[PDB]
Amino acid sequence: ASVQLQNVTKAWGEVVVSKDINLDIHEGEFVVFVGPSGCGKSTLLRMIAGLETITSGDLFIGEKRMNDTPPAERGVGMVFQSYALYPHLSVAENMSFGLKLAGAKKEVINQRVNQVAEVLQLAHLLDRKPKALSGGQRQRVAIGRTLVAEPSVFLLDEPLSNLDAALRVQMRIEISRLHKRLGRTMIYVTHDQVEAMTLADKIVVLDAGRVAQVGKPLELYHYPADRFVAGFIGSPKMNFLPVKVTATAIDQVQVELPMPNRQQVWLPVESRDVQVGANMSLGIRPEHLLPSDIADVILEGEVQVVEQLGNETQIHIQIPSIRQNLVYRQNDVVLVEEGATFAIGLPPERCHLFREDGTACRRLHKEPGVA
Amino acid sequence: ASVQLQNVTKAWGEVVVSKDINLDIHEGEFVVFVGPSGCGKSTLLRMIAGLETITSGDLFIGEKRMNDTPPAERGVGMVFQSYALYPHLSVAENMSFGLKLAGAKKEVINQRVNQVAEVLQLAHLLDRKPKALSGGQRQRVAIGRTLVAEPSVFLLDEPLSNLDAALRVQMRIEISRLHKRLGRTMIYVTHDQVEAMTLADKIVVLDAGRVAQVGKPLELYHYPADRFVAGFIGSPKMNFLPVKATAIDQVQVELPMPNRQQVWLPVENMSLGIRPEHLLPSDIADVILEGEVQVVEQLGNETQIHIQIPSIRQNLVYRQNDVVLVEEGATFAIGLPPERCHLFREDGTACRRLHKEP
Amino acid sequence: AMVQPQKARLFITHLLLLLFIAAIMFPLLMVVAISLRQGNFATGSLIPEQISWDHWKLALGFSVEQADGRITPPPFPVLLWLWNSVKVAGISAIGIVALSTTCAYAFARMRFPGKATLLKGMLIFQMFPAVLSLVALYALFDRLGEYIPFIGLNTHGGVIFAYLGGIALHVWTIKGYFETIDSSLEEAAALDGATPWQAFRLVLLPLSVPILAVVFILSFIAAITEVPVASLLLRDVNSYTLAVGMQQYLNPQNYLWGDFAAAAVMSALPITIVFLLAQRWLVNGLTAGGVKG
Amino acid sequence: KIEEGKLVIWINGDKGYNGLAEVGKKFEKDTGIKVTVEHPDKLEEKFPQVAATGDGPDIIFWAHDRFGGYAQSGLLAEITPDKAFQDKLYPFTWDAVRYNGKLIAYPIAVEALSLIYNKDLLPNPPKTWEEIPALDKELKAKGKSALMFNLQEPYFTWPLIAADGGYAFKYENGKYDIKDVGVDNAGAKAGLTFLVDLIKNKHMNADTDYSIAEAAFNKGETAMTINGPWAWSNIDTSKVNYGVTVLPTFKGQPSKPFVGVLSAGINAASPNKELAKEFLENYLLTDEGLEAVNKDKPLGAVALKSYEEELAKDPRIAATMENAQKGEIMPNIPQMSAFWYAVRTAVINAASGRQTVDEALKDAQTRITKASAS
Amino acid sequence: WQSDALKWSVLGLLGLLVGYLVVLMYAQGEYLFAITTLILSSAGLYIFANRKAYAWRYVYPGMAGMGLFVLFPLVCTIAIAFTNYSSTNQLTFERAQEVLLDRSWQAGKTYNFGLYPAGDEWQLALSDGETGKNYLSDAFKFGGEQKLQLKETTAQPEGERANLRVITQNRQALSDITAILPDGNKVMMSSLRQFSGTQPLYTLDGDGTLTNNQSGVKYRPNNQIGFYQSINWGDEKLSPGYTVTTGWKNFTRVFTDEGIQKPFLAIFVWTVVFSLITVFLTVAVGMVLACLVQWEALRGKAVYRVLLILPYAVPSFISILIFKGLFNQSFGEINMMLSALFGVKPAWFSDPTTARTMLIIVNTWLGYPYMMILCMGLLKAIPDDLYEASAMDGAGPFQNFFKITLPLLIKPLTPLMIASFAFNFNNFVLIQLLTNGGPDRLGTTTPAGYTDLLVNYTYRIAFEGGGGQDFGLAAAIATLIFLLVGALAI
Numbered sequence A: 001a002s003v004q005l006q007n008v009t010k011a012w013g014e015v016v017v018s019k020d021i022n023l024d025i026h027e028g029e030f031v032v033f034v035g036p037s038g039c040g041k042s043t044l045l046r047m048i049a050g051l052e053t054i055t056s057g058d059l060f061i062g063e064k065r066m067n068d069t070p071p072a073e074r075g076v077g078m079v080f081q082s083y084a085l086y087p088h089l090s091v092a093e094n095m096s097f098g099l100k101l102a103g104a105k106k107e108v109i110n111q112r113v114n115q116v117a118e119v120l121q122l123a124h125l126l127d128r129k130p131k132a133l134s135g136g137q138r139q140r141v142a143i144g145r146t147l148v149a150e151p152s153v154f155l156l157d158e159p160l161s162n163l164d165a166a167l168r169v170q171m172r173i174e175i176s177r178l179h180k181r182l183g184r185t186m187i188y189v190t191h192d193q194v195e196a197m198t199l200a201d202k203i204v205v206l207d208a209g210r211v212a213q214v215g216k217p218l219e220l221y222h223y224p225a226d227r228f229v230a231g232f233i234g235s236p237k238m239n240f241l242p243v244k245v246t247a248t249a250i251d252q253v254q255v256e257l258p259m260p261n262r263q264q265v266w267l268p269v270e271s272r273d274v275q276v277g278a279n280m281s282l283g284i285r286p287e288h289l290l291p292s293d294i295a296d297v298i299l300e301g302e303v304q305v306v307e308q309l310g311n312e313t314q315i316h317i318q319i320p321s322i323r324q325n326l327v328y329r330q331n332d333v334v335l336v337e338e339g340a341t342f343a344i345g346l347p348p349e350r351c352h353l354f355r356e357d358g359t360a361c362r363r364l365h366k367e368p369g370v371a
Numbered sequence B: 001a002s003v004q005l006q007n008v009t010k011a012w013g014e015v016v017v018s019k020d021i022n023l024d025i026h027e028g029e030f031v032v033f034v035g036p037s038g039c040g041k042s043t044l045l046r047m048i049a050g051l052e053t054i055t056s057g058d059l060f061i062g063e064k065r066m067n068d069t070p071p072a073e074r075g076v077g078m079v080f081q082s083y084a085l086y087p088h089l090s091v092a093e094n095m096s097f098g099l100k101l102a103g104a105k106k107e108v109i110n111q112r113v114n115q116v117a118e119v120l121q122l123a124h125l126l127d128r129k130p131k132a133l134s135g136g137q138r139q140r141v142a143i144g145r146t147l148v149a150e151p152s153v154f155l156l157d158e159p160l161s162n163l164d165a166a167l168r169v170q171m172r173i174e175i176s177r178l179h180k181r182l183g184r185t186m187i188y189v190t191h192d193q194v195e196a197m198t199l200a201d202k203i204v205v206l207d208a209g210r211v212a213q214v215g216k217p218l219e220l221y222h223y224p225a226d227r228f229v230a231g232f233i234g235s236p237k238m239n240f241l242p243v244k245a246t247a248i249d250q251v252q253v254e255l256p257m258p259n260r261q262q263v264w265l266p267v268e269n270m271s272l273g274i275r276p277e278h279l280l281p282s283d284i285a286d287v288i289l290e291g292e293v294q295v296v297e298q299l300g301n302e303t304q305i306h307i308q309i310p311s312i313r314q315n316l317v318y319r320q321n322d323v324v325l326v327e328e329g330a331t332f333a334i335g336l337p338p339e340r341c342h343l344f345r346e347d348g349t350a351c352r353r354l355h356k357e358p
Numbered sequence C: 001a002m003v004q005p006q007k008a009r010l011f012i013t014h015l016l017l018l019l020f021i022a023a024i025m026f027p028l029l030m031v032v033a034i035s036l037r038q039g040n041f042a043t044g045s046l047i048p049e050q051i052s053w054d055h056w057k058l059a060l061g062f063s064v065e066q067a068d069g070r071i072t073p074p075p076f077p078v079l080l081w082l083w084n085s086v087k088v089a090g091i092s093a094i095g096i097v098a099l100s101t102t103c104a105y106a107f108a109r110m111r112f113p114g115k116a117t118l119l120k121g122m123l124i125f126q127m128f129p130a131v132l133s134l135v136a137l138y139a140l141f142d143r144l145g146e147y148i149p150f151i152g153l154n155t156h157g158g159v160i161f162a163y164l165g166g167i168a169l170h171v172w173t174i175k176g177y178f179e180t181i182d183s184s185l186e187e188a189a190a191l192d193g194a195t196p197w198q199a200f201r202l203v204l205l206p207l208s209v210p211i212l213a214v215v216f217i218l219s220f221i222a223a224i225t226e227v228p229v230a231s232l233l234l235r236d237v238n239s240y241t242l243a244v245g246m247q248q249y250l251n252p253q254n255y256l257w258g259d260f261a262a263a264a265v266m267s268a269l270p271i272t273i274v275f276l277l278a279q280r281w282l283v284n285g286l287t288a289g290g291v292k293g
Numbered sequence D: 001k002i003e004e005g006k007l008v009i010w011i012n013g014d015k016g017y018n019g020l021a022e023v024g025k026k027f028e029k030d031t032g033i034k035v036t037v038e039h040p041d042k043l044e045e046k047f048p049q050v051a052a053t054g055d056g057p058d059i060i061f062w063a064h065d066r067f068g069g070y071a072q073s074g075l076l077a078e079i080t081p082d083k084a085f086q087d088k089l090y091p092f093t094w095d096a097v098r099y100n101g102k103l104i105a106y107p108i109a110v111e112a113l114s115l116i117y118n119k120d121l122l123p124n125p126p127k128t129w130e131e132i133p134a135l136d137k138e139l140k141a142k143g144k145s146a147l148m149f150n151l152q153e154p155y156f157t158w159p160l161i162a163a164d165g166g167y168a169f170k171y172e173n174g175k176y177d178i179k180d181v182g183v184d185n186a187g188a189k190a191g192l193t194f195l196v197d198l199i200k201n202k203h204m205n206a207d208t209d210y211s212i213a214e215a216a217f218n219k220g221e222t223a224m225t226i227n228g229p230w231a232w233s234n235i236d237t238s239k240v241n242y243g244v245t246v247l248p249t250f251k252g253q254p255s256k257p258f259v260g261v262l263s264a265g266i267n268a269a270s271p272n273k274e275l276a277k278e279f280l281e282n283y284l285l286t287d288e289g290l291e292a293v294n295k296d297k298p299l300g301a302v303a304l305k306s307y308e309e310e311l312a313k314d315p316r317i318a319a320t321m322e323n324a325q326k327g328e329i330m331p332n333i334p335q336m337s338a339f340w341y342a343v344r345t346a347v348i349n350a351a352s353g354r355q356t357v358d359e360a361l362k363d364a365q366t367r368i369t370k371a372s373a374s
Numbered sequence E: 001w002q003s004d005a006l007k008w009s010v011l012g013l014l015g016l017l018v019g020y021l022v023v024l025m026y027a028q029g030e031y032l033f034a035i036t037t038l039i040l041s042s043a044g045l046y047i048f049a050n051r052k053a054y055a056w057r058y059v060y061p062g063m064a065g066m067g068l069f070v071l072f073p074l075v076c077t078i079a080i081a082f083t084n085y086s087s088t089n090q091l092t093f094e095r096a097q098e099v100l101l102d103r104s105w106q107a108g109k110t111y112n113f114g115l116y117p118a119g120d121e122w123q124l125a126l127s128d129g130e131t132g133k134n135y136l137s138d139a140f141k142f143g144g145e146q147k148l149q150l151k152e153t154t155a156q157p158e159g160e161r162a163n164l165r166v167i168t169q170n171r172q173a174l175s176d177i178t179a180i181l182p183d184g185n186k187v188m189m190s191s192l193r194q195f196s197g198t199q200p201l202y203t204l205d206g207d208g209t210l211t212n213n214q215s216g217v218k219y220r221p222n223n224q225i226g227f228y229q230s231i232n233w234g235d236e237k238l239s240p241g242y243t244v245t246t247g248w249k250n251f252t253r254v255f256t257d258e259g260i261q262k263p264f265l266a267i268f269v270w271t272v273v274f275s276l277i278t279v280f281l282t283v284a285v286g287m288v289l290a291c292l293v294q295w296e297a298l299r300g301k302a303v304y305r306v307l308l309i310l311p312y313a314v315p316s317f318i319s320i321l322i323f324k325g326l327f328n329q330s331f332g333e334i335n336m337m338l339s340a341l342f343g344v345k346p347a348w349f350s351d352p353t354t355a356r357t358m359l360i361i362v363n364t365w366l367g368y369p370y371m372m373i374l375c376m377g378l379l380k381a382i383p384d385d386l387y388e389a390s391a392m393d394g395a396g397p398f399q400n401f402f403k404i405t406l407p408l409l410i411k412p413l414t415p416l417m418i419a420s421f422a423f424n425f426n427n428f429v430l431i432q433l434l435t436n437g438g439p440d441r442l443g444t445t446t447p448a449g450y451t452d453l454l455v456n457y458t459y460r461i462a463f464e465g466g467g468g469q470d471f472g473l474a475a476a477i478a479t480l481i482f483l484l485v486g487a488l489a490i
């Protein structure tokens, strides 16, 4: 069940899709992979599975070196991103195909399929072939086929993508439970930021075949190790203002906002390898921007976009001397036009800072719920 | 081009999948179809497409009957749920395929492909076959294939499912950028709430075949017609409590909790509804609602708290901004705003909310 | 399930098929004419002036009262021959499909030293002019015959065994079809624990059913109609295939055209049946809904 | 290794094999030796392949021409009939079954082309070829036509070509001179020139094959045709009142059709040569013996004088023997392989107008003579 | 799952049969069949033995048949090309020597014999037809070689003449009796009726020479041409003649002879052109039909489907001859129809190009169902949603075919088109039956025609052309036209 990767590399001739990747997944640990579309998430899974060849490096599942083991003998099961359902067999036959190859009893097979089909709301669809199913039903068939098989390593490749919000919740809890009932290793790939946050005992960020950062869910949200990671976790994206260093203290850095007024602000952020004058990049999340009336540092501009979400309102503002729009989030339904003058408060204790090479300056303000 | 359905129905032998549905979609209107996995969104979308037969009812595109018209002549284009890419053709060749059929202009093609390949961030992959791509890369090739064709009526089936949250933002925008530049009708199936709320001029909520409600994004959010619509629009789900004297311009009910408090609600065995986002902290409100914490979900931007109230079998979901240090088992209280409450009949229909929202 | 259109396109094709059929059926309707014409004439009117049933009666076993009074019994067991043609072709085809299919699986799903050499070796070595082959085959089955008598000369076993040599093409044919089935279906199988054989039998074959029917049809036809090998190997009249047997109707100066044509028509019958039965295996979209992409 | 103390016989499927088995059943009743008669497909080709490695039948029945090939390959034993026996058969049949002036098979039946005619359309058939054009016009006026035969295959046209002096290979005194070929000489030329003339005057059609001529006669569309004894049973089903007579003469000299003598040869590898000799000589080649095979399927003309003298009571067989006696024995030399193609193609060119008579045969001869050289 | 030890019992019992059948083949004399059977089984058992040759377990059962009934005959054919195997030299040396050693000549007189029962013993009588003298022997016992002295007699023997049945039963014992006349003549049983002075024509020497008892000529084995020849060589050679390895003589002969080379290239063009056009046509005709028949809008499809493959169901031999009947120039129903409408009679057999055309119509007629049946299955592999996608890109029937259906079919169909080219290239039969290679290529020393394929023009040299049936030449050419179609498969 313990899956470990050391200096794992995958090349497609000259194109490198995974470079020197190192991970350590302990038994019963829920590890969630995230990264941009086409960065190598599935490639990592398919190497763990044994459906792709590892170019160089070692793969250890159960402390056994599995580089050259056939797929069957790996103790690994996978919900394929492309489903790969047997299109000649019913939902039932699909979900029971794994145990039919084991020496399973008919009453064992029929009992644990009717149970796992009930939690995925597939009760009624049990006789249909994949042709006679919806996209989200086929996806659920794929999830079920693996839950029935109950392997030492659960690999789940974007398994919830094609389900409604309300169901995507109901599946999340059943997977959450199964991880705590079996106590077995699950590697779970998703784009859904909420899933990444809730299900993960630990999250891995990928970036063009490179491990960007590993850590707890709150550990990445609050403390990205660089610019890329900061821009990837949390939707909407984190706003980025180009700033200049004016003064440095060991415990903090003072910077200058690019507006006409050349306002200055002290940020609780390490000054390790930061020179006065040099150009940084100030990160601040839409959630963290304050209302103007109760702030020391104010930024003002013109509203470009307003998106009414019901629960909240999202307001994109063009603030002079910055090319990019600042995205701001407000609780409740807010009545704003396009072109209205809008001002937002910027809180120094919640500002991230990144060097010219993109690396973050460790935030020294202790945020709640971080070990 | 204008598109409308009229008492439209579809059956597989005698299993009804679309029940007497009625929709008027004007030209240059962006409409999104929402519904629970397996209600009939693609089935409907495909009936317009011509890929699926229509049992009974009438389908009009550009003010002429289309029921017996072959798909290739209805003036529609589509991004399939399953991509349905051409395996023998490269990324470039898949996209440029629609044009090469309708009068190939050798230069205009290369330009329109490169333009659309740039926004979908596919430019560096144009020589690849589908097999040598990621799940999301394939999906974007499918999207491109339609947008390069510039059909009269766009049909999009969950086209942003396997995209990362960040690139998903960039695609929403570029679809709006295509919608206003063309002024062409778009029917858009999606599971994403944000995509439904931001893109749509009109949202169609589908439920096991039938049309559950049609309206504006905020209109369905504030004013849902029945039990089902409330619990579908807005994630996490709206909470429901079983309630039990009425005034002229408002309705009073009793809470099924130990204290048995009575509260008046500005509306037309009942069911009460309250969203997680609407619930307040304890000391602010008049109607206090306290229970035991069950599940705490740390989302980063917010904290989502599950509460079990005595004699209430269902968990009450509460949302509160920022990181809130609260643990399982702890006792929690939340405020219940009566003006932000929904009421639902024994059958399901909602007693129209009378409070006027922004 | 799909919405269909102008139905003049059906009308125009229905007509252009009917005319095609008539044109290609006409050479065959000429044969049925010969088998019904009295005496033995290779050429006459399509609906013969003098129609006889004697040719079809002798093929079917019935005795014939001729002009002078005497009853002619059937000279040959034409029917038995047809039964022999079926056993030999049928079993042979089962054998060809079985061999070429397993052989194909390895060329398409497995990797081993000299794969391209053998596949291109198969294609090339079968395309050799088989002119002095009969002088070689007799020598093999003559020898083989004393060690295993069941597959020697004058045995249906030997004939079937000889036909199991020509799989080269069929291997290419099934190798091909295999490759258009998505890999991830057998990967999913493998991860469910299935051995390569189980993946081959439970996942891949059921989806390759149409091409297997094709290979079976193409074998059957080849073997019903085959004359040289079978005529060389079989010696007892009651073991003859219908192809081999109807050679009796062909002589130095004349052919018994009527008897021969009747035999020629019968050999089309088992093919027609087998072809008709194979249809339930010739279905579209067997992969439908399997793989997203 | 051919099984000792029994007789395996091969004969073609259109001969009376059931009758031959009846004679072999009489042989078994007298000698104890069991006889078995087989009729395998392409036995003419099957036999050499088996007789080479010491197998095959004890006796084989095929037309004599093929035996000069087998004997060269060393597949046939040299038979030894006494003068008394040799006098029972027509002497010219013995000339057919010689290799290197040594007898290699027993003549059984005699087969050759005759002149078949409709008695109703034509009561008196012409003795001469020159009578044809005059006879045709008076028939064409009644809608019909005079003569139709297979012009495409030179076996059928050779009688006329060789009537004046044409010959395959010069038979000196028992040996075919393979250098001396006569398809070029004034005789073969005069025949073919007359043949083309019949087509030119539109009495005959240049592209008339066997199948067409046979159908024309059985339907009464033509008054007379050229065909062998095999064709008779066809005309009998049509219920046509017909006769078989001698072939017309060209320039006074008789038509010289190819003679096909059916022969029985002994396998050189047989441990039963004596048993086979006795069976052939004393059991088959008798009045009683040949009757059993002929009763099954008619042998036509036979080599045995005595049975032939009895069969001739049916005018049809007597015509067959008459023409064969006046005709040319088919050379049993391998050099005929070249002859057949070259002369077939020669008549094709002359009849179609592709080449004149003179050059078409001059070409044909150069082909035969230089194929027989290299 | 069965027993794990059950596999080694199956492997041991097969490793028994092999070894037992191998040793049993080494005895009596079957050696070539033993070297080949050991290697095949060794490979076969080793493959199924260790769990690392897994891939070869699927390929081996298939390849076994190919090696045995395809490669083996190919090898034999090549092997024969190095020899003079023919009509003239068909026998092995042992078989040709054997045949010459059975040859016998009549040296003495000829006496009709009878057999006479003398109690339990036998008595032999002879009768000289030429002098009218009779001869009679003493009472003798059967079995083994004995010599009987015959006395001139006037009397009849006391026993009653024996059956042909009794003569036949005792024929063996009879054939060893050397009867000796009073004048002192050796005479033996030549037939069941006669005793004669038959003696062998040849006698085997020792150093390996055959001397003739009648003439006195000595003959020696000439292993260059493969005959016995007089002696140092004279000018007379004896038949049969035996098969002898002649190195390259038959391969070189194709390169040697100017004459067999004049029409070569011009034919080679026609054969290639003929084959390509057929391949192109059959595939095209077969593919469209396949598409038309699986089209679900069509409502008679199941009938059309069956009727369309019928040209392949009726054996081709009779079909081809019927086509020879229809295409007749003056008669024949094709030019009957073409005379009423249009009013022209095409010269199908006479004119080279119209013949070449006829031949292609017929070849297409015979071969289209094959390609159709292939595409019938092959088409079922193209998923339906590919045509749903083309509907959304606005493609019609014709556009679907050329952009999707056809490109998807060419890749699998390719090796079935290459093979079809190889088959029709050697399509000896169709030509022979229909046109016979006609019409004439005027002025060909070795005969050729305009519709002749390369294999047709060849086997007329090797099997006709008057030189017997030279198989050694036929195998030499076959090997050459395989090397050409090999260098054509490039």
Ligand SMILES: CCCCCC/C=C/CCCCCCCCCC(=O)O[C@H](COC(=O)CCCCCCCCCCCCCCC)COP(=O)(O)OC[C@@H](O)CO
Binding pocket: C009, C010, C013, C016, C017, C020, E283, E284, E285, E287, E288, E289, E291, E292, E294, E295, E296, E384, E387, E396, E397, E398, E400, E401, E406
């Ligand atoms: C010398 C060739 C002679 C061959 C003629 C054979 C004689 C039969 C007469 C038929 C005449 C053809 C007329 C065509 C009329 C259109 C019929 C039609 O309209 O029916 C179409 C049938 O397609 C189809 O055969 C597609 C139609 C194919 C049209 C192309 C024909 C030209 C032939 C060139 C092809 C050569 C290929 C070269 C190979 C290397 C319907 O197709 P779709 O629904 O889009 O397909 C999708 C679905 O089937 C699958 O879900």
Ligand SMILES: Nc1ncnc2c1ncn2[C@@H]1O[C@H](COP(=O)(O)OP(=O)(O)NP(=O)(O)O)[C@@H](O)[C@H]1O
Binding pocket: A012, A015, A017, A035, A036, A037, A038, A039, A040, A041, A042, A043, A044, A081, B131, B132, B133, B134, B135, B136, B137, B162
């Ligand atoms: N067979 C192949 N040959 C070459 N390159 C490939 C192949 N398959 C995938 N790639 C590339 O490898 C990269 C990563 O593949 P993959 O791991 O599938 O991406 P991913 O992280 O799963 N993204 P997504 O599935 O879209 O969320 C992509 O950019 C592909 O273009």
Ligand SMILES: Nc1ncnc2c1ncn2[C@@H]1O[C@H](COP(=O)(O)OP(=O)(O)NP(=O)(O)O)[C@@H](O)[C@H]1O
Binding pocket: A125, A131, A132, A133, A134, A135, A136, A137, A162, B012, B015, B017, B035, B036, B037, B038, B039, B040, B041, B042, B043, B044, B081
């Ligand atoms: N061929 C078929 N036969 C029978 N039932 C079918 C068939 N195809 C689809 N269905 C059913 O039709 C219902 C709706 O189809 P569909 O429109 O694909 O669902 P959907 O709304 O697209 N949901 P999803 O794709 O999961 O977001 C599903 O519940 C299927 O069970």
Ligand SMILES: OC[C@H]1O[C@H](O[C@H]2[C@H](O)[C@@H](O)[C@@H](O)O[C@@H]2CO)[C@H](O)[C@@H](O)[C@@H]1O
Binding pocket: C222, E278, E282, E316, E363, E364, E366, E367, E368, E370, E419, E420, E421, E423, E424, E427, E430
């Ligand atoms: O190509 C014309 C050809 O078609 C058929 O031959 C087939 C044969 O039947 C198959 O078994 C395989 O070998 O392919 C051949 C063609 O590639 C006809 O039998 C044949 O007469 C005709 O010439």
Ligand SMILES: [Mg+2]
Binding pocket: A041, A042, A043, A081, A157, B134, B135, B136
């Ligand atoms: Mg992926």
Ligand SMILES: [Mg+2]
Binding pocket: A134, A135, A136, B041, B042, B043, B081, B157
């Ligand atoms: Mg759908």
